[PDB]
């Protein structure tokens, strides 16, 4: 009764220690460098909005220098 539960236990340990190491090494390092890509790409959408708004505030100043 202790031989048949022994050899079926390390059959269910290798299918669990692989599923733990499939998450720590394949699934989580794919998500944590996906999330590193969202932040670097959302910083570039803010500077493109920063450049479009500073372009307009430079144009609105020139039109207010004519009407003086």
């Amino acid at each position: 009764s202790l031989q048949t539960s022994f050899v079926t236990l390390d059959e269910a340990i290798k299918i669990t220690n692989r599923r733990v190491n499939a998450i720590e090494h394949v699934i989580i390092p794919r998500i944590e460098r996906t999330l590193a890509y969202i932040i670097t790409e959302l910083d570039e959408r803010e500077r493109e909005e920063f450049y479009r708004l500073k372009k307009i505030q430079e144009k609105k100043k020139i039109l207010k220098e004519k009407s003086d």
Partner: protein, 199 residues
């Protein structure tokens, strides 16, 4: 009488809201209840239960930027939507006013359909009635503010919206509440607002 839409109707005293607004849906009435005189926000034709019942006297529905063939179904079934009062099968267009505004209509008139439907709702508030306002898709109202502020060359907030977007929604949601109305016969009315956002 003639009243400007962007100016709040005067009143004697604002009162705390203590009576529930029974929507009829079981999750909205038991777990997360609304009261008459209170403000609500869903990410939303549907909501027929607000019309047939919910113990409110008049119903004012504002379709702010609603679609083409979905606006024409609201004004199609509302004349033949009936209810019971004391055993009489009575139609719901005796106590319903619609503010129909499709997105084909101009963008300056989309921001004025909200202020119109709350002024008619504050008018029937003053008679002692219990108004229930359903402002459909206020995200299209906030889209009309993004377009108008872009045409006047204004500086935006995050995601392109104008920076006074939080002060425009607050000037419409804070017009709803149970009150003691102005005038001598001592009556009390209320306005409930259910506004929709991006689903």
């Amino acid at each position: 009488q003639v009243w400007p839409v962007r100016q709040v109707r005067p009143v004697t005293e604002k009162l705390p809201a203590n009576h529930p607004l029974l929507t009829g849906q079981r999750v909205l009435d038991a777990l997360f209840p609304c009261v008459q005189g209170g403000t609500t926000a869903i990410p939303g034709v549907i909501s027929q239960s607000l019309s047939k019942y919910s113990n409110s006297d008049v119903i004012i529905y504002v379709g702010c930027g609603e679609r083409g063939n979905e606006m024409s179904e609201v004004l199609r079934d509302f004349p033949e939507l009936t209810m019971e009062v004391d055993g009489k099968v009575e139609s719901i267009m005796k106590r319903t006013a619609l503010v129909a505004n499709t997105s084909n209509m101009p963008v300056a008139a989309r921001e004025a359909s909200i202020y119109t439907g709350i002024t008619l709702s504050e008018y029937f508030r003053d008679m002692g009635y219990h108004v229930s306002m359903m402002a459909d898709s206020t995200s299209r109202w906030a889209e009309a503010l993004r377009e108008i502020s872009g045409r006047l060359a204004e500086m935006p907030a995050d995601s392109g919206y104008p920076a006074y977007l939080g002060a425009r929604l607050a000037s419409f949601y804070e017009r709803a509440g149970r009150v003691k109305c102005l005038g001598n016969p001592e009556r009390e009315g209320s306005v409930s607002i259910v506004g929709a956002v991006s689903p």
